[PDB]
Enzyme design. Structure first.
Site, PDB file in Angstrom:
ATOM      1  N   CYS A  29     -45.826 -57.962  -8.675  1.00  0.00           N
ATOM      2  CA  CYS A  29     -45.197 -58.693  -9.761  1.00  0.00           C
ATOM      3  C   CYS A  29     -45.957 -58.699 -11.076  1.00  0.00           C
ATOM      4  CB  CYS A  29     -44.921 -60.108  -9.340  1.00  0.00           C
ATOM      5  SG  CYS A  29     -44.053 -61.057 -10.602  1.00  0.00           S
ATOM      6  N   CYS A  32     -46.839 -62.271 -12.173  1.00  0.00           N
ATOM      7  CA  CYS A  32     -48.032 -62.707 -11.422  1.00  0.00           C
ATOM      8  C   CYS A  32     -49.320 -62.092 -11.953  1.00  0.00           C
ATOM      9  CB  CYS A  32     -47.875 -62.371  -9.934  1.00  0.00           C
ATOM     10  SG  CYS A  32     -46.540 -63.295  -9.143  1.00  0.00           S
TER      11      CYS A  32
END
Length: 106
Positions: A29, A32
């Site tokens: 991600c 993230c």
């Protein structure tokens, strides 16, 4: 941020008398990854609290039962209770995370 690698470990650290902050994330991600570029100073300001990470695909049971609806999410626990939940849609900048933690720890 120490990685939590099991459901039992999760239970264990969230039943802390002092609050605990958990980042739910995944390796693919880019949001993230973004958060990790700016989160370290916030962790330092909030040093008195324990910070952990949970891989969202690794502990699904935890994810679903804590109502983690996107990543990265930041959830705060104390004595086993979820006391605050920063949903990923609002976890996009250091300003947003700082403000969430200030509101939760006030």
């Amino acid at each position: 941020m120490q990685s939590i690698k099991s459901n039992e470990s999760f239970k264990s650290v969230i039943n802390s008398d002092t609050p605990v902050i958990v980042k739910f994330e995944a390796g693919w991600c880019p949001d993230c990854r973004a958060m990790d570029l700016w989160i370290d100073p916030i962790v330092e300001q909030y040093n008195d609290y324990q910070w952990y990470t949970v891989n969202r695909d690794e502990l699904e049971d935890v994810v679903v039962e804590n109502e983690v609806m996107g990543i990265p999410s930041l959830l705060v626990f104390k004595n086993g209770d979820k006391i605050a939940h920063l949903h990923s849609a609002n976890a996009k900048s250091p300003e947003q995370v700082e403000s969430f933690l200030a509101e939760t720890f006030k």
